């Protein structure tokens, strides 16, 4: 029950790092945000879902 | 100490408080790359 939470929050850290690196780059770059606008939405939604899941699995630990 | 599950991520928690300083430095880096225009 603890290893699952640790893996989940490690995935959350990795996704937060990826979003921090990508989102300003995607938005500022004139080439991006047209062919890859939905990628930002999917990444942010996955980030919030990971946050909710970590909050859930914290209760059982 | 941190709750035991989260105790593994301590090395991130031990560097996170100083991040805003880097932000200031990052701003200077941007002014360096832009050529202090």
């Amino acid at each position: 029950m603890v290893a699952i939470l640790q893996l989940l929050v490690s995935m959350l850290i990795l996704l937060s790092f990826a979003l921090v690196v990508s989102v300003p780059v995607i938005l500022v770059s004139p080439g991006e945000w047209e062919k890859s606008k939905g990628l930002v939405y999917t990444g942010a939604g996955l980030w919030f879902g990971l946050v909710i899941m970590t909050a859930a699995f914290n209760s059982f630990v | 100490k941190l709750p035991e599950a989260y105790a593994v991520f301590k090395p991130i928690i031990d560097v996170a408080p100083v991040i805003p300083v880097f932000f200031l430095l990052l701003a200077f880096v941007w002014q360096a790359a832009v050529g202090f225009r």
């Binding site: 790092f17 780059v25 500022v28 991006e32 | 090395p11 430095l25 990052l26 941007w30």
Partner: peptide, 28 residues
């Protein structure tokens, strides 16, 4: 070692955005 690696990754994440913007020649 973990502290140093995390610090290095965080310190890389900042200028990495600027480098990627310069490569894509965006509004820097």
């Amino acid at each position: 070692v973990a502290q140093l690696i995390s610090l290095f990754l965080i310190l890389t994440s900042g200028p990495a955005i600027i480098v990627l913007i310069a490569l894509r020649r965006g509004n820097l």
